[PDB]
Structures are given as structure tokens and as C-alpha cells.
Amino acid sequence: RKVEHVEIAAFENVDGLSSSTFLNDVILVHQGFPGISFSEINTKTKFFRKEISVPVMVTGMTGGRNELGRINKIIAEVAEKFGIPMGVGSQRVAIEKAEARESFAIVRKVAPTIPIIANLGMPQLVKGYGLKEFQDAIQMIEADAIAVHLNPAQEVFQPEGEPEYQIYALEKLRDISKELSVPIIVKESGNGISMETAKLLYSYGIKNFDTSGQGGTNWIAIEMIRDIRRGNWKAESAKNFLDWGVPTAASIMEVRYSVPDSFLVGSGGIRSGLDAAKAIALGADIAGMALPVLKSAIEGKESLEQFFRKIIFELKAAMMLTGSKDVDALKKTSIVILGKLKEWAEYRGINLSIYEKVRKR
Amino acid sequence: RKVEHVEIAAFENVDGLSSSTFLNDVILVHQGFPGISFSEINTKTKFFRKEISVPVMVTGMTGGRNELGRINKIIAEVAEKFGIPMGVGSQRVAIEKAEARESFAIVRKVAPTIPIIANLGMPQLVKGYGLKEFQDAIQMIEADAIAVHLNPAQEVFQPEGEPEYQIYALEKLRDISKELSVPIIVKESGNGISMETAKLLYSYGIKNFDTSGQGGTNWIAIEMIRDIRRGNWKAESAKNFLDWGVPTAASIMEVRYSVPDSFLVGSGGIRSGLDAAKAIALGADIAGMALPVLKSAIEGKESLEQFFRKIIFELKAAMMLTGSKDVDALKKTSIVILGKLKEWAEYRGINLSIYEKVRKR
Amino acid sequence: RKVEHVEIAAFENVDGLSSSTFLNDVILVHQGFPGISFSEINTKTKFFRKEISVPVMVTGMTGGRNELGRINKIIAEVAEKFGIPMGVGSQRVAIEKAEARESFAIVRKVAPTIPIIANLGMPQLVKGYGLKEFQDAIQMIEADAIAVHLNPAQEVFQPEGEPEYQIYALEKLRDISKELSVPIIVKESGNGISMETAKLLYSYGIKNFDTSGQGGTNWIAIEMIRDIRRGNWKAESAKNFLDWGVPTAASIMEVRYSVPDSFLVGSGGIRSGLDAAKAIALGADIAGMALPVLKSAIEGKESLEQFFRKIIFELKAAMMLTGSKDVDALKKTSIVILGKLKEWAEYRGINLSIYEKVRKR
Amino acid sequence: RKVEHVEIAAFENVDGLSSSTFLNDVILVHQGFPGISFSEINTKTKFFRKEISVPVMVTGMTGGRNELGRINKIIAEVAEKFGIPMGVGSQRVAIEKAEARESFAIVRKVAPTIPIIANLGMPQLVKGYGLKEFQDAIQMIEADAIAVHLNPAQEVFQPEGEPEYQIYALEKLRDISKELSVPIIVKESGNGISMETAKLLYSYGIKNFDTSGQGGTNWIAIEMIRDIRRGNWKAESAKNFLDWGVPTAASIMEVRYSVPDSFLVGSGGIRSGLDAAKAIALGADIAGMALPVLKSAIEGKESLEQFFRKIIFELKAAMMLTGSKDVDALKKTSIVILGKLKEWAEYRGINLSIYEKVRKR
């Protein structure tokens, strides 16, 4: 299943299927006189208590079997080489089975210095996970943070089970955050974070968000494919929901606007360093990527190293061409917002002038 | 003719031909933390004095011959099983001919508990139909309401006759509503209800509306096909009017805005539980369907049962993914309106902020 | 030349080539309760001192040779039969040559009652045409009005000569209008009348306008074809100007807004009774057509009679479906303006609310 | 390299590749009564201390080798014949190597009267070019002005080196402008001038700007091709930046708005006299062209003479059809701005009403 998800994501057509990030509606303003030289560009930024080399992270994907651990090992060793944070996939299977632990632990063996982010699902909190399970997920990889994932859309359309997101999960999460020695990030899984969800999470003490908006890996498409494969009836219902979700660009605006002091990962269809530059200029603190890192990792270590070189060059290209000497300058560089993203923001009450102010701090 | 209409609708290409519901311009905001579990979602709602299981109805289509009665029987027995209200097609032929009565009456034999809605055409009121004919339509199926249909566009382009909609029809309707023991719904037939028509109807005491907007079954197209078939000249005129009408989404807004306390069926191209959810979030109380139910019913009882299962699942998926525990929560869930629907509303003086208040209260 | 124009217009691809009327941006609001019956719809309207049967006119095209006279004869006898006003083409050639007179005069022989509109070009007034030439054009067909045509775009791109539009032409026109016993209409020839041109003309006493906007017969395209045919260099310059001009729908708004008491023909790409209905609802008093009437007339009398039957039926269909009992009701019926037409009006300072008032008063 | 650039630009598909000038969003309002005759249209304008025949210039491209000098010769002799100013390509190579001088000097031999504009790169000013190098570039062709070019986008993606744009380059430019006897123009190279860049340049004494926006020659695409040719990794990064830059139309508005008294060349994808007319009406003083002149020059002298005849005719056609008797009238002619250009301006704080005033006062 963990294998089926990786196989469908890697080898089927589910990246941006019938969906959109709205990042085509964001334009970074070109500066013919940048005021800087390329070699002075500094891409360093903070990630909680650590310093990272590039404002980019690999968000959680996998682990739980030996083949999955070996993808994890490739990603972690390259992320370590580049000074990039790495999230692991859901650790539930390793909480339940001790054999599954090594496919996660290998990450910290091979990547001793970079931030490592643990992973459990929100529904677990209503299915009897609490402090201990969180502490075990964290300890298992000596995590610097834990991501708690929201995936209700995926769960609605998958052949098995049904989503459970009672508010008790948040009361529980809020208690756990009291006893935990590392921060919690709340992340979506391809369908995005709205302002109602961001505000609700914030009222429970959540300050760190990962948008994971639509336009990237389409998890409803992935479950549609799983349903097709088993002749399950839900397949054609999933098809009607292929464009369901908040587009990544809209989600970045919604979280930055509604929680101005959040620490924000902009992810969900980040595929180039230009996407990453746009996500940051729009209001993210860092850009997150999952699928393209998986596909590269599967090809090999050297393929993944080339991938990160390309992303970093493209990010720096966008910084050079906007006169942004550092990540901070990029966060306040000039942009244009047009088209559907503009209409979305307007309808949603995002005053574009107070937005400009909020994103530039 | 009643057969010709069924055959063209079922088997020719007239569903959304050159027309649009504007429902693509409506987005339901995804909630990554729904605040509920799937199993607590409650789809029950009121339909006049009865409780229905799902905020969906089958709107009037057919009856008047044995083969038509057997489609009615299938739809009625499945609607009964699902707790879904059902309208019958125009009852004129059974007012005139006693042989035609059974093809309507069968509906109540097979569906004893659900709301059943009778049907006569508005032009009949200027052609000498009154209280007695309405009472007979109602009594024939022990109806819980009567739909009075507007189809002037269909009548303009059909080979035979000409439309007649003098206001005397409404004075008469208003008198009838005084003596009748069930409510009157006024419905269109594929071309939509505007705010001028809604307000006029309302000034005569009409409080129940069924939008039946363009973007679904194209009745102008159906008449175009009948015209082509008989070498009638009007065919190419009908072709020019294929996109005539108020789109379903715009018609929902117009009626909810201009008559805030209306009981409102949003129909005309509702083809999925997602369309149904959108129509309800926009301001409808319930969503209506006709064509897709016909096509399923023609395939058989089990085909139609699977159809309703799919609609209901898709509806609940939208409720789940929006954090709507019940139909009432759905009616006030967050939306985005973009594109042509937005421009339509603006031009039509629909202040989007007072609209939000009206559709949510 | 007069024949080459007819031949290119009738048989080449120049109708709406790379151009647009903007009439797709105008929607007539459907009224599902019209409040009228089809048979009470009255299409009569005033045309100066005469009453016409339909708010439609055939605008000027041809005359000057026997074959051209025989097209004129067909158009005139059918327009007479339908109670429709008819303009003739430029009469210059018959002012110059007595042989050319009959191909214009035939129109009045065969159409003794309808309004007939004479035709001369604005540039003629700067090439020494005056009162007498106007009187002779008028007397030659016992005209009820004279159209003075603007065609600078055609003249710029045609193989021969160059346009001349000095204001002296207007001083002269203004003097002529003093001595003339019939009104002057100023018309364009495919490229439309702006507010600056309308206000200038109005300051010289012109109150009757015919928009002749882009989207219909593309005269720049016709001249491009003439250029291609003779290996003239201007062909590829004409190609760059194919979409030059004010779209018909924008031109109707611009003239109605800037001269609220104008008598206005909305023409340029009117191809159905729906186009005609839209043009009138937008602000025109009557709709004009040229090319489709030519093409039909060339096929024959019976073909042209069917053409007008179709136009008239489509017009009345739009009146029915909008609850318009007469032309006046149509002029104030509810519309929606979207898309590029809306952007054009906004940029051009056409306040949509003062526009509504002006088109309806 | 200088030849590789010419060969790719001339013979590969890089003109407007995945980019747009936004000039489709600018409409000149047609005037059916122009108020002028074609033969009185006056295209003369000022270019610093000289008078030019047409408000058009050939912007800098080439020089430095014999084959390049012979293209320069053709352009220069034709520009001289038409009274059109001409810029030369970067003179760096001729500052370094005396053999390279003649391929620039030939321009002044063959074009003794027209304005000739020298050329050096902004990065040279941080690599130790100063007063003397500027004087030598100017003296070598008896230049009437010197252009300093911004090409950071091209430099980012080219196989070799890295862009350097420290502000020291501007302090140095400011000093040089004090000792130079001819004006400095700052120009981009296909990616456009923003308001931040224009204002910064202005604060250092720059008053003359050449937009060189995206939508014309795509220099990122040219470097992409150079990269593909050498199997360089940056090719696929360049591909992601193909649409990077300020569109020419947006750049004209940004410079005119932020520096209302600037002398402004509108260039980047000017391909017809209609484009040139639109650029000028929008806010440019003159329109600039490079690529289409190169392509014509390569075909031959007579081909380039035909090219200029066509541009001039198209320009005058736009002036005739807007009632613009001279260049000054064109600068204040009526326009419509729509679509993405309108959204760009609005987002960028370009108040359209104060814009109207600035572009025509």
C-alpha cells in the first residue's frame, strides 16, 4: 500500500492532473539593474533552531519497508550534503511494528546535522495516539520537529475506511504540544490549507503550517487509480473531485494573511526554483517538495544531486533577476498577482494592500 | 411526442449542448481539518411537511402512456427506497384521457411515503384550467405539492403552437393557491428563473421556485432536433438560441437574492453530488435532477440505485471536505465565486456581501 | 470595381475575419414568465416620418451597373413586401454617368412605400460635391433620407488613392443639411463610430448615426484580397489591421452614451434576429444588415424572403423570451454585459449605471 | 559568439518564444472621421539635438568582425536614406582590439547625418571601464548618444560567466555622464524596465530609457539554445524562465508613470508600424526595433528598404485612422487598455486616470 502509493505517484500521471497551483498567476518583477552580483547571493535561512543552506525542504513521503528505507537513505544523504531539511513519511507502521523502524532511523544515521521532521496523521489522535507515540516518532529519528498530516480528501476516496477529524484531535494535539520538546507543523497532503483551517489550528496553539495545496501530486487522482485497479465504484466519484482543494498559491496567501506570524512551508506542486522563489515571495518562509524528489531518488543519488543543483540555480536565478541578495529580500521583492488568484483573494476578503504589508514582514 | 421527447433526451446529444450552468465558477473551500467524522454527516432535510433523507429531488419528466408509466414506476420505487422526493411529468394528458391516469398513479402505489409532486403547465391556466384540474392532478397521485412549469423557450421553437403567458395566468394561479391544500412550486424547464420573474411570481404569492437553469437538458436543442427531423425551417433559428437562458448557478443567486425567504430547488444540469453540494452552498435548499435519472431508469432499477448511491456519496464527500455536518452547515459553508458568474452577479446588482449574508441566513 | 467588391464580399471569406462585434458579451435576460403571448408581439417602429414593420433595415451596398441594379431590384421588392427600409450603395457613379441611374431608380419603382435611403461618401464633400449632388442622389430614388458614409480604413488599404477627411467636409455637410428636405444619417463601413467621432459629428448638427462596427463585413480584408490579387505590397500591411475598429456592440454603447438623443442604427455583423434584438436592447433604435442580404439576394427572391422570415422570427423569439411586447419594451429589457465589452466601456468612462438609464430613456 | 548570437536570432525560433509584449491588450480607438488627409500626416520627431524622419529607431545589435560590419553597413545606409536613428551592438570588442573598429566605424561613413548611438554593457562599469572607454566608443562612430545595456537575464543563463550589477556601476555611470558631451540611454535586452529600476536609474541622473521588454527577441531562449548545443545543464533551467520579464507594453507604462519626463524608446517585439503606433500612444517617444531589421538586412539592402516602407506605411495608417496629424497627436490619441495589461497596471499601483494625464501632458 505504502509501495502502491509510491509506484502510482512515481510512474502514473498524477502530478497536477486536472488541478492547478495558481502559480502561473504570480509574476516576480524583473529588475534590469539588480544592484547585486550573482556570487553575493545568500540562500541561508533559519529552520527552527538550525540554519539551513537553501529555503527549501523535502516534505514527508515514505518509510516502513526495506525498499522504502533505501529511497529514504538516498534522499537523506543528499539532503545532508545540500544542507536541506527532510521530513519522513507517516511513521504509524513503525510505531506498530519494530521491523519498520530501521527504514526511518537510517535517515538520521546518514544525515546527522540537517533538520529531520517526524510524521504522524491527525486521525491517529482520535484513534488513541498521544504523547508517547509522538515522542517515539520523534526519538526514532532524533527529529527537530514533528509534522501532523491532514489528508481527509485522500481518505474519502480511498477504497478502505473513512476520515475522522473530530475536534477532540486538536484538544489532544494542544496537550501534546505542551509536553513535546520539538515544534509541531500541521501539513495538508495535496488539497491545501484554508484560512478557516489555519485559524482553527492557530486557536489550538499551531503556529507552523505546510500548505500542501492542489496543483502538485493529486492524491484524489492516486486513490482514483487505486479504485480503478480494484473495480471499486468510488473511482468515478474521485474523477469529479480531481480539481478539489485550495491551490498552493491561494493557500500561501490565506495562511500568511490569516496568521501573519506563522512559520509557513509553501508546497504542493513546487517543481522548479522559480516555483520556489514565487512561493517565498508570496508569503512562504520555505518552499516544500515531495514528488520530484521521489522520482529523482528512484533514479539514483547522482540524479537527485543534479535535481537539487538545478532547483538551487533556478532559485538563485530568480533572486538575481529580482535584486534579492538574501531570502529576506526575496520575501519582500515586487510581484504581480493576476487572473484567478486575484479573483480568489478578492472574493475571500484578502485586501491586496494589507496583504502586501503582511507578506513583506 | 411525449415518447419523442424522452427518446431525444435519452439518446441524442442535448445535455449541456452549447450551454453552461456556470457551476464551474463556484468553488467550495476545502477544509483540511473538517472538525467532524464521515459517519456523523447527516443529509436529512425538510420538504414541506415531510422529512427527506437527502437534499435532492427528481424533478418532473414523464407519464401518459404505458411505457412512460413503467419508467415512472422504476424512478418512484427507487426514490422511495432512498427517501428522495419525486415530481411527475405534465399531467395534462391524464386530465384529458382516463387511460393516461395509471402511468401517473403507479408512482404513489410504489412510493407511499416520499413527497410526490404533481405537474401542470402555466399556459393551461390561460387555456381554461383552474382549481378542479389542479385538484385532479394532485388527487391522482396524492401529491404533497404541485409544480407549475414554465417552458416558453421550448414552445417558441417547437414545430407546433405558440407560447401564451398573459398575467391572467398568475391572477388565476393566485386564486387557485387559496383553495388548494398543498403548496405550489413554480419551475422553469431548462432556461432559468431570473430575478424579474421570481419577483413577479412572488408578488402573486409564489414562494417555492425550481430554477431549472441552462447548462443541463437543452430543450431548445431538443426542439431543434424535432424541427430538423421534420424539415421545419425553425431549426436553424433554434440553433442561434442554443445558449439562451439564465445559467443554473446565476439563477440560484438571482432567486435567493431577490426572494431571500423562498424555498428553492437548484436544478438544470445537476449531474453529480458535487454539483448538488455547490447548488445548495450557493443558496438552494435542495438540488433537482431530471435527465441523468431518466437515462439510469431506462437502463434499469439497479442502474438507478447505483446512480443515487454515487450522488449521495459525492454529496457527502463535499460535506466532509468542507466540514459540513449537516445540510444547514452546507448552506453556510465557505465558497469562492469567479469568472463569468462573478461578472453576471455584479452587472445584475447582486452585492456579493449582502449575498453572503442572505445565502447563509 | 463595384463588381469586384460584390464578388469578394459574396464569395470570399471576409465576414468577421479576425474581428468581433463584441455581441457575445451581451446577454438578454430570459424571462420564464414573459407576461405576454407570442401573437401580441408588435414589431412596428418609426423611421423618420414613416412607420416600418420591423426594427431592421438593409444598409447601402450597390448600384451602378445593370447586374448591380438587378440585385437592388430583388432587395427592394422583398424589403417592400416586408415593410423594411432599404439604403442603396454609393450613388457617385450615377451622379457622374446617366447610364448608371436606372440601377438605383429601379428601387423606388418596385418599392413605392418603404423608406429608401440615398448614399454618398464623406470624401466627396471635400472633392467638390455640394447641395445639388445631394439633391440629385435624393431625387433619383425619391429618398426619405441620405446616408453619408465614412470609409477611411478601406481607403487607406485599397490599391488606389488616399483618404481625405478635412473638417471642411463637415462645415459643408452642416450647410447642406440646412437646405435639404430629408434627414442625413452618417454611417461607417465596417470599422465603427467612436464617441469622439459621434460628438464631432453632433457638434455639426448630425443626430442620425449608423454604427457599422467591426465584426461583420471586413472591408480591410476585402482590400487586402484586392491587394493580393494585384501583387500590391499593402496586402501584408492590411493583414496587420484586420482587427482594427470599434466592435459593433462597443460602438452602439459609445454613440448612445455620448449622444443620448441620437437616432441610432446598430449594424456591422448583424446576422440573426438575436443579434438584432441585442443591438436594440443595447441602445440602437434599429438593427442594420448588408452582407447576408446580398448573399441571399444573389441566390434569389425566394431565398431572400426566407432570410427575412428567419430574422423576423428570431427577433420575435428574443422579444417573447424577454417579455418584450413591443420594440420599446425591448429597448429597456434586462441585459448582462460581460468580458471585453465590459472592460472596453469601463476604460472608456462609460459608467454602467448612467448607461442603463440612458439606453432605457 | 557574436556570430552565434546573430545566427540563432536570425535563423532559430526565438522571436516571442513563450513570451508576450502585452500589446494585444492595447487598442487604438478608430476615428471614422479622422479630420485630416493622409498626405498631411507628419512623422518627423526630435532625437536629442537632431530631427528624425520617423519616430522609430534601429536599436543596437552587432559589429566586431567583417561579416558583422557588412550587416551594420546595410542597416546604416538604409537608416540614413530613411532618416532613422541607428544604434550599434556592444563595442567592447573594439575597445579591446583595433581590428574590430572598422565594423563599427563603417556606420558613420555610410550614414553621415542620422543619430548614431554607441553601445557598452553595464557590467563593464564594474569591470573597470570608465570615461575613456566611453569616449572611445562615442568617438569611433561620432556617436550622438551612448546606450548602456542591461542584460542580467541573458548572463544568468549563458554557458559562461556570471552577472555583476553592484551599485558602484551606477555611481561610476553618474560620474561619466558629467564628463560626456553626448547623452546616455539605459536600455534592457529583452526582459524590460520596471519602475524600481527606472527610479533607481533616474536617482543617478538617467533620463533616457529604452524598455526592451519581453515579447520580442527572447534572449533567455537564445542562451537556452546555446546551452542545448553544448549539452550544458542550464538549458532546462532557461526553459523555466522563457516568460520571465516585464512585457514591453507594461514596461512603457511603468517607465512613463514613474519617470514622467523621461525620453522613452518603446522596444522589444515591435514588428509592425501598428506596434510602433501603440507603443507611442501608450507613452513611448519613439519605437525601437532590432530583430526584424537584422533579418531583412541579411536578405539585402532592397529587402530592408521594403521593410522600412512597410513599417512607415503601417505607422501612418494608424495615425490616419486615429486622426493623428503628427507624432504629438498620436501620443495623446484615445486608447483602450484591457486584459492582463490592465491587471498588471492595477496591481502595480498605476492609477489609470493619472496615467492618461501623464502619457499625454
Ligand SMILES: Cc1cc2c(cc1C)N(C[C@H](O)[C@H](O)[C@H](O)COP(=O)(O)O)c1[nH]c(=O)[nH]c(=O)c1N2
Ligand atoms: C509517494 C508520496 C507519499 C506521501 C506523500 C507524497 C508522496 C508523493 N505525502 C504528501 C507530501 O508530503 C506533499 O504534501 C504532497 O505530495 C504535495 O507536494 P508535491 O506536489 O508532492 O511536491 C505525504 N504526506 C505526509 O504528511 N505523510 C506521508 O506519509 C505522505 N506520503
Ligand SMILES: Cc1cc2c(cc1C)N(C[C@H](O)[C@H](O)[C@H](O)COP(=O)(O)O)c1[nH]c(=O)[nH]c(=O)c1N2
Ligand atoms: C424527458 C424529459 C421530459 C420532461 C422534462 C425533462 C426531461 C429530460 N422536464 C424538465 C425537467 O423537469 C427539468 O426542469 C430540466 O430537464 C432541467 O433539469 P435536468 O438538466 O434535466 O436535470 C419537464 N418539466 C416539467 O415540469 N414537466 C414535464 O412534463 C417535463 N418533461
Ligand SMILES: Cc1cc2c(cc1C)N(C[C@H](O)[C@H](O)[C@H](O)COP(=O)(O)O)c1[nH]c(=O)[nH]c(=O)c1N2
Ligand atoms: C458588397 C457591399 C458593398 C458596400 C457595403 C457592403 C457590402 C457588403 N457597404 C457597407 C455596408 O453598408 C455595411 O455598413 C457594412 O458592410 C457592415 O454591415 P454588414 O456586416 O455587411 O451587415 C457600403 N456602405 C455604404 O455606405 N456605401 C456603399 O456603397 C457600400 N458598399
Ligand SMILES: Cc1cc2c(cc1C)N(C[C@H](O)[C@H](O)[C@H](O)COP(=O)(O)O)c1[nH]c(=O)[nH]c(=O)c1N2
Ligand atoms: C542579434 C542581436 C544582437 C544584439 C541584440 C539584439 C539582437 C537581435 N541586442 C538587443 C536589442 O537591441 C533589443 O533591445 C532586443 O533585441 C529587443 O528588441 P527586438 O525584439 O529584437 O526588436 C543588443 N543590445 C545591445 O544593447 N547590445 C548588443 O550588442 C545587443 N546584441
